[PDB]
Amino acid sequence: GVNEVPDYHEDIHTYLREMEVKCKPKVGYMKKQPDITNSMRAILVDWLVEVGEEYKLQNETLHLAVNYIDRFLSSMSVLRGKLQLVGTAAMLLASKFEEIYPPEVAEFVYITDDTYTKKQVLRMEHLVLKVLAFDLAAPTINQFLTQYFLHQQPANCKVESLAMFLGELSLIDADPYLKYLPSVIAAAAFHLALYTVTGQSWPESLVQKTGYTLETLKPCLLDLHQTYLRAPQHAQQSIREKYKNSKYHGVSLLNPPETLNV
Amino acid sequence: GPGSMENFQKVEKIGEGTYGVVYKARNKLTGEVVALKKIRLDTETEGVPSTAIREISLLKELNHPNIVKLLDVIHTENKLYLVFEFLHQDLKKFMDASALTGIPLPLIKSYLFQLLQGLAFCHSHRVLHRDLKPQNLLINTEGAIKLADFGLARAFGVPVRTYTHEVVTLWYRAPEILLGCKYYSTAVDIWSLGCIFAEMVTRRALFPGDSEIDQLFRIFRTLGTPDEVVWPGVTSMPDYKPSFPKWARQDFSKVVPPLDEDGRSLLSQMLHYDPNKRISAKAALAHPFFQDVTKPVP
Ligand SMILES: OCc1cc(Br)ccn1
Ligand SMILES: OCc1cc(Br)ccn1
Ligand SMILES: OCc1cc(Br)ccn1
Ligand SMILES: OCc1cc(Br)ccn1
Ligand SMILES: OCc1cc(Br)ccn1
Numbered sequence: 001g002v003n004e005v006p007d008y009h010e011d012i013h014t015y016l017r018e019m020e021v022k023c024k025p026k027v028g029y030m031k032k033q034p035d036i037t038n039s040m041r042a043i044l045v046d047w048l049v050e051v052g053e054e055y056k057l058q059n060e061t062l063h064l065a066v067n068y069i070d071r072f073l074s075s076m077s078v079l080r081g082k083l084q085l086v087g088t089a090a091m092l093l094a095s096k097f098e099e100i101y102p103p104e105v106a107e108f109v110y111i112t113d114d115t116y117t118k119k120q121v122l123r124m125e126h127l128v129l130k131v132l133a134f135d136l137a138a139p140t141i142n143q144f145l146t147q148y149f150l151h152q153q154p155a156n157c158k159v160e161s162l163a164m165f166l167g168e169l170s171l172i173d174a175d176p177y178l179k180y181l182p183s184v185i186a187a188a189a190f191h192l193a194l195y196t197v198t199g200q201s202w203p204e205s206l207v208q209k210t211g212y213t214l215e216t217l218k219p220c221l222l223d224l225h226q227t228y229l230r231a232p233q234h235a236q237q238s239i240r241e242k243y244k245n246s247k248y249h250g251v252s253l254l255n256p257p258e259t260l261n262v
Numbered sequence: 263g264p265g266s267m268e269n270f271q272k273v274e275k276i277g278e279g280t281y282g283v284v285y286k287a288r289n290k291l292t293g294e295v296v297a298l299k300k301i302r303l304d305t306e307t308e309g310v311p312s313t314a315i316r317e318i319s320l321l322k323e324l325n326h327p328n329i330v331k332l333l334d335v336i337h338t339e340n341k342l343y344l345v346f347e348f349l350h351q352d353l354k355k356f357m358d359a360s361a362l363t364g365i366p367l368p369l370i371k372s373y374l375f376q377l378l379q380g381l382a383f384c385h386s387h388r389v390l391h392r393d394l395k396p397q398n399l400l401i402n403t404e405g406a407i408k409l410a411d412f413g414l415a416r417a418f419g420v421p422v423r424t425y426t427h428e429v430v431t432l433w434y435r436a437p438e439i440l441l442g443c444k445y446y447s448t449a450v451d452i453w454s455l456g457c458i459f460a461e462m463v464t465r466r467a468l469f470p471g472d473s474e475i476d477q478l479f480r481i482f483r484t485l486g487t488p489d490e491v492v493w494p495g496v497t498s499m500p501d502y503k504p505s506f507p508k509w510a511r512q513d514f515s516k517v518v519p520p521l522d523e524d525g526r527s528l529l530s531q532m533l534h535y536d537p538n539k540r541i542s543a544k545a546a547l548a549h550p551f552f553q554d555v556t557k558p559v560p
């Protein structure tokens with residue numbers, strides 16, 4: 001299990017828990033954004049999802065980009081006309097950090113329909129770097145999920161894929177999800193996926209690891225269950241389309257449960 | 263942030279990296295001596311290099327006595343300067359210029375102990391180094407040694423995903439990389455420290471191959487050609503070939519003859535074929551080889 005770093009998984013989990021509190025965006029920065037809204041952010045994130053599937057980027061890269069965007073919008077006011085430029089530079093930065101083979105800058109320009117220039121993307125790249133002070137090794141929902149997956153008895157790929165979709169769905173809707181930590185959304189996502197596929201519940205072994213119980217997860221879990229019920233109707237549909245693909249076991253086609261018994 | 267190039271006085275060039283030159287400089291207000299790594303962006307067409315983004319982001323969060331310290335990052339005009347703490351020499355220059363009659367065993371023992379501390383701290387902070395070699399290990403005048411050059415380093419997840427292939431300078435590269443394995447982990451850094459351990463004793467590289475296959479062959483001639491018993495899965499690995507010559511494992515006392523029993527024990531566990539059996543940095547700190555350890559000066 002060296003691929004699962006037995007000698008370091010706890011040290012790592014503890015550290016990510018510390019780092020998610022330090023890298024957290026301001027819940028409700030949108031109220032203080034004069035010209036942009038949650039609905040605009042949702043459009044951007046949904047687009048970033050399509051960009052990632054087009055360039056066959058990792059899920060981690062998406063998660064990082066959203067992280068960078070949220071933290072950036074926490075201190076910088078942005079006109080709606082520049083919101084995409086921010087997202088574009090976020091996606092470039094995350095790709096250079098996490099992708100074996102990042103897309104070239106020219107390709108990031110291309111996906112913006114020549115709204116922006118190569119010069120604009122690069123100057124924004126520098127701005128985001130400055131605003132984040134290069135703090136780019138941020139914990140994601142996804143980093144917690146992959147560790148939670150080690151606690152399956154036994155491993156189920158439908159469970160894994162369904163958890164990543166739900167966690168991904170959360171990235172779209174800053175309200176409410178900005179009020180939860182990655183580690184908590186991942187927990188809710190994992191339990192809901194597990195309950196949906198196998199009827200089972202958040203394992204005691206993960207209670208030990210995380211300190212979280214169904215009690216502590218309940219609020220986030222009630223929201224995620226709604227997001228899941230309502231997902232066929234959401235204005236943004238890119239994640240559902242993505243998760244129809246075999247790569248992800250077609251999990252967006254699974255029916256959500258009507259109730260949780262929580 | 264806390265600094266501008268107005269307050270640095272260049273002293274002399276000290277080296278060269280992939281994206282520029284390193285200088286030794288002096289802070290003119292505090293007296294502090296530093297290493298400036300200049301990275302040029304003016305002559306960059308894809309914005310800030312991914313190497314620098316990783317180096318900076320990962321070093322920011324690794325505060326530890328055996329990891330060189332990133333003190334600052336300055337963006338002047340068209341330029342990006344990394345300010346690092348200053349160490350006088352790297353391990354390779356010391357084995358080549360001051361280890362003619364050899365490195366004394368206390369000093370090998372102290373250095374390996376400190377390297378393991380630094381690497382354990384890396385691994386506990388989801389970071390693989392992926393270029394541990396003596397050139398990238400910096401020594402001071404007080405007896406300290408520090409992991410350096412994080413330009414090939416990478417933040418990992420648990421479990422690990424497929425990362426970049428063919429990482430690690432060849433002489434220091436682990437068999438699982440040479441055999442093209444889908445996944446590699448923290449054990450690749452231990453393999454490197456193992457080669458380095460041996461190299462401190464002999465002052466010569468342990469497996470100086472001139473190609474991937476020659477590297478494998480040299481490893482196999484020393485440690486024996488691995489099979490399913492010593493390393494389950496090896497025969498099904500992407501670049502494993504059945505035609506591989508089947509060399510017998512030579513008695514380990516013949517690989518590094520000056521090494522005592524404890525040393526051999528430790529080294530054997532650093533160079534285990536199976537990455538699952540290979541010792542971690544964390545477990546290695548307790549190995550009896552370090553029982554009597556101190557921190558003497560170069
Ligand atoms: O709905 C308004 C809007 C959203 C984005 Br993202 C970009 C431009 N305009
Ligand atoms: O280039 C596609 C696109 C992205 C956004 Br954000 C808004 C509208 N269209
Ligand atoms: O992008 C960082 C982030 C996003 C959400 Br949705 C919740 C918490 N943190
Ligand atoms: O002072 C600004 C700064 C310092 C470091 Br270390 C890394 C990035 N930015
Ligand atoms: O003023 C520019 C500069 C460059 C170096 Br390298 C050191 C100090 N100052």
Ligand SMILES: OCc1cc(Br)ccn1
Nearest residue numbers: 277284297346347348349
């Ligand atoms: O050669 C690169 C380097 C040298 C020193 Br000294 C410190 C940090 N980085």
Ligand SMILES: OCc1cc(Br)ccn1
Nearest residue numbers: 473475476503505506507
């Ligand atoms: O390049 C020489 C070589 C020999 C063998 Br056996 C396998 C691969 N390459």
